[PDB]
Copies of this chain bind each other. A is one copy, B any other.
Amino acid sequence: ISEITYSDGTVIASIESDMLDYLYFTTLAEAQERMYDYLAQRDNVSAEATQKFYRDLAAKEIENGGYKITTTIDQKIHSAMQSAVADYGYLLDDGTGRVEVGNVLMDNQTGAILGFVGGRNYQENQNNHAFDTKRSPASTTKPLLAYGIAIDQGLMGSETILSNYPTNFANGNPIMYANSKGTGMMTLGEALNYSWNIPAYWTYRMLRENGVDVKGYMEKMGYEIPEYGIESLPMGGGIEVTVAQHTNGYQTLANNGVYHQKHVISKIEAADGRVVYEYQDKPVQVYSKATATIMQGLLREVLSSRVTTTFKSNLTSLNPTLANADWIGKTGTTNQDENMWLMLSTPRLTLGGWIGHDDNHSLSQQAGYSNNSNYMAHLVNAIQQASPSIWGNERFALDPSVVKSEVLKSTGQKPGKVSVEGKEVEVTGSTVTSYWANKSGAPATSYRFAIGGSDADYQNAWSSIVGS
């Protein structure tokens, strides 16, 4: 007689007990953590690896008591998501075995989880790849941990230049991206669309050199990272996250920089009217509104450029109308292709997606670029068939507090006079608008104008520029 229900109150199951489906265990486990804090607090503790007596009590309270447990799960969307993974799951198998999958669909204004995919098939495997397994987010780390923070601290703007010239780790090893040692200077947009690694590495070093509390940012979105003094951290080195938590970081970018904590339980009510737990809205401005809406604009291009994912193309062919909603996203690829991530938002929703194997062995080279992008387009279509207005028709837009600068294409700073080789120069050339999240906008071009680069790099780029 204790009960778990969908957001509209329809029963999911009753809870009982015995001695010897993803939806059931996920929602029960979150309901038990809610019951525990409630119990711990009503007996005024804060003491203790028992504990652990409170876990057991919370399970008993729910399996004996008569409690109504309201979830955020939308029955139609969640069922459509199961049918999707059942009908199009095979799209992910790439010749490397049975490829597993995790997907969380989150509401950007509230943090509520509308539906999810726990895996390919509960009966054949029960690991919950939406809420339990933790893998490096790799590249999908770079907007949250490196570029979004640098934009937020007034250290760069949308058309800032970064170095992708070859450079080494402190140990001598060259920093790589697939087989490439590096190219030269590029925009942010290019560093993002292609997902290069050297530009994120220099951004994070800048942040450290300037004393940015990067930990403060990540903690406010609930990320737990044990060691920040890692050179590859912007590449996802030393980080490991569930699909649900990571979706929650993209929710933050999509919601104009304002976090709401992910949840699957909204209310726990006793048969006697005692409300044991109700979700409190607790919004947190993590990035300014200028930062987040600037970041949205870049992530729009990461998908429309198709450089690292075929998603827009796949979705165009399945549902050209849905494909013209305002989609933004980032992909991620682990160093041996062990894990592929694709994160998508419209202004209303965020959908996180991971694929990999349980034993961590390698996927094919294109599992992320192609298989996962195509499977996710199917899943996005399904959610839509079930709830045709849930993705929303609104567009992401720059906040009015965003600051505009006219800069040069070649330096991403204002045109101006710099001294090169001792001998002076007047720099000019084709220009562009770059967006900033400070008061003053972009600076005037100085000698070292980009994020990173050795002296030899700057001498090579400066030279080619004065090729005017």
Contact = CB atoms under 8 A, between A and B. Distances in A.
Contact of A310 (B91, B306, B320, B377): B306
Which of A91, A312, A317, A318 lies at the interface centre, i.e. has the most chain B CB atoms within 10 A of its CB?
A317
Contact of A316 (B306, B312, B320, B374): B374
A158 to B, nearest CB: 19
Interface string A353-379: 000000000000000001001100110
A312 B371 CA distance: 12
A318 B313 CA distance: 11
A94 to B, nearest CB: 11
A79 interface: no
A153 interface: no
Contacts of A377: 317
A317 B310 CA distance: 10
A46 to B, nearest CB: 54
A314 interface: yes
Interface string A289-314: 00000000000000000100010111
A317 B318 CA distance: 7
Contacts of A370: 313, 316
B314 A316 contact: yes
Nearest to A378: B317
Q: How many copies does the complex hold?
A: 2
Interface in A403-444: none
Which of A312, A313, A373, A374 lies at the interface centre, i.e. has the most chain B CB atoms within 10 A of its CB?
A313
Contacts of A318: 317
Interface string A80-116: 0000000000010000000000000000000000000
A310 B306 CA distance: 9
A127 B253 CA distance: 51
Interface string A373-401: 11001100000000000000000000000
Contacts of A314: 313-314, 316-317
A429 B417 CA distance: 42
Nearest to A314: B317
A202 to B, nearest CB: 22
Contacts of A316: 310, 314, 370, 374
Contacts of A374: 313, 316-317, 320
A318 B374 CA distance: 10
Contacts of A373: 313
Interface in A317-356: 317-318, 320
A377 B320 CA distance: 13
A312 B374 CA distance: 11
A464 to B, nearest CB: 11
Interface of A: 91, 306, 310, 312-318, 320, 370, 373-374, 377-378
26 contacts: A91-B320, A306-B306, A306-B310, A306-B313, A310-B310, A310-B312, A310-B313, A310-B316, A313-B313, A313-B314, A313-B317, A313-B370, A313-B373, A313-B374, A314-B314, A314-B316, A314-B317, A315-B317, A316-B370, A316-B374, A317-B317, A317-B318, A317-B374, A317-B377, A317-B378, A320-B374
Which 6 residue pairs across A and B have the least CB separation, nearest first? A313-B313, A310-B313, A314-B317, A317-B317, A317-B318, A317-B374
